Ligand binder design. Sequence first.
Ligand SMILES: [Zn+2]
Ligand SMILES: [Zn+2]
Lengths: 89, 84, 96, 81, 237
Amino acid sequence: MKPMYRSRSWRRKYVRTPGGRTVIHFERRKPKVAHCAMCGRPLNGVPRGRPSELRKLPKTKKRPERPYPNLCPSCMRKVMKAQVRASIT
Amino acid sequence: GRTTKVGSAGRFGPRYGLKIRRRVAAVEARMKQKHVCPVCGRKAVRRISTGIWQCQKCGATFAGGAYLPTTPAGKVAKRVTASK
Amino acid sequence: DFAFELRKVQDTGKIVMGAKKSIHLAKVGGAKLIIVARNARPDIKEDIYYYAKLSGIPVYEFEGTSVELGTLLGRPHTVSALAVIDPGESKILALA
Amino acid sequence: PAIEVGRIAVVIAGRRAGQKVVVADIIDKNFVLVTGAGLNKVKRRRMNVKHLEPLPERVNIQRGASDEEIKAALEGAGISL
Amino acid sequence: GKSLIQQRRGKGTTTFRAPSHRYRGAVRYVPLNLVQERTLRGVVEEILHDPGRTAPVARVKFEDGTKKLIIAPEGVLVGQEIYIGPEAPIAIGNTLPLAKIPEGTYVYDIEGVPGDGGKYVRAGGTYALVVSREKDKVIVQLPSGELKAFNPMCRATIGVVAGGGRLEKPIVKAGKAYYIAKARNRFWPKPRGVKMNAVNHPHGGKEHHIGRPSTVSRRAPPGRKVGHIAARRTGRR
RNA sequence: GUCGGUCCUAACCCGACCCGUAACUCGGCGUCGGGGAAAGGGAAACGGGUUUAUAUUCCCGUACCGCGGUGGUAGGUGCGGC
RNA sequence: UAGGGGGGCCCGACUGUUUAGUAAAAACACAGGUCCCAGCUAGCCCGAAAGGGUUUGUACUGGGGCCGACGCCUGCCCAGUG
Ligand SMILES: [Zn+2]
Ligand SMILES: [Zn+2]
């Protein structure tokens, strides 16, 4: 093992080969899930991945269609209601 | 629990002396009881960090004392500026 | 609120306690009076005041707390909002 | 006042969030019938009353009407969607 | 001879310098040349621990968008609105000029000269009390007991600093003191001068005693001010 | 092309302007700019064979990334669900 | 593979550190006690100056000395030196 792989940011895994070798493969770690701006609660409908993984997805497979996809639904409804009630006069 | 005299300072065992063990135990016992919230009235307030207190139920987060949510001078200032 | 008037409602008429039910009755209709506690969530308070000022239902603001309402009633829990549907033998609507 | 038939409201959930809508009928305690009425891209669909915010505006119609019959009312009443 | 610790500190080496890259930024109010007569409004959006401060700090967002740090008062809530200016009410957390603050009020974070950003009464649990107002000076009682006059246009904030009672509990262990000192790169552990050699300290020598009065004149040269510097008295009472 | 270096910043360092010094290849300095990690952050390749001695680098098989084109379509001007 | 045990006395409260290569200790440090300077263009300090450290700090703070966990206590003297 090289020093770059003695580093615990590489998540080693053991894998048996079609030739009977049983080698070690190295991969980088996955980033965590998107969180709400107001409450810090987790979001739904948003996939996890590194940039190369996210660039192999279309636009509509990355976020929910509804407005304000960066907020949890309760906070979204708060925002829409406040807009409405300020659009009265 | 199953100690006559020592409390949280039973982690010390024999060491560091009476005065210091007693004081640590008392401060920590008064700190680790659930306190009344100033927004909802329920007993669900705990210390996050030195000077920072949070309620588990309503989620209310406020600044206070080191080992208690209120201080005497704080209560006096509240009373006086409520007068004026 | 008055201990005796609200307890008389409790035993003579019919009440529906809880903020979700109160908001729903203020939105659709089917209530006579709505009582809200001072320190209740501003979200709930705003929704109630809006829907009831539209529907035409009177709202009384109880100066005490949600815990105190709950205990006033025979209940071990918060009662932040309350809806009087059926009054009886009491003068509770006379206080708004 | 109520969720009266003829009431104008905004949707606050889903795709069609930020859009006015006129109420047409009432199904259950929780569900009502809302039409976009072809002013805007919303069809004749049952919706929950948690998902609508009612506006003070109103319209003269009957309990259960049609889409060509509502568009009229908004002709003169003075209501754009 | 050889040098003292107090002389090596002046050189400015890593052994003595504060690790302020670890801290949250400095704490200052808002400049007058941008709060002249406007009475700005802000909302509290976070309360934070600061490693170089002894007091908790709060993050305030203002209307334009500008975010800033303030020293937090005992009682302030996340989601609370504060006001900075001359026509701001008298309420815990608001910043006003001394000329608009009644007598008897508890005050913190006082400026020395108007516009300097805040200098006085900053530590956990401290408070100052307003004593007298006049047209040329406002007299305030500082936590040392001392009465001091300020210009009436100097700004202060109303309430008490948060984080009091800190010293109610013993440190107990040497390791806890290790960490507390490392947090601000204080010289720890501390040596005694009477158990140093004579080349190292004006005390010092194999018989471990001060052999001359420990009171030292205010006019003594550097390398010689150790013990009790210009003491008016010594002892118990 | 796919492994590492060539990018980013950390603690820190340097230059110009500016100030000091009888002066300097000396001492400082906020700012402007530039540097600073082959175990921190950071696009993309795996298995089998081949040589006396190289191989995730040559060969066989089967893949991926970036840039640039060609030709069609979704969309612009579309929908299902409270 | 795998503890010999018990009773008295002196020092140091304890975990920790020390004379690389004749001293590991009863010496150092430690929590804690108490005294001194200082309201900030401060107090203490580096430097030939310019500038700078404590300072992204403000008396529940920063600097300077002596004793050294805990318990019971800490008497008299300001003529002399300071
Ligand atoms: Zn949210
Ligand atoms: Zn609460």
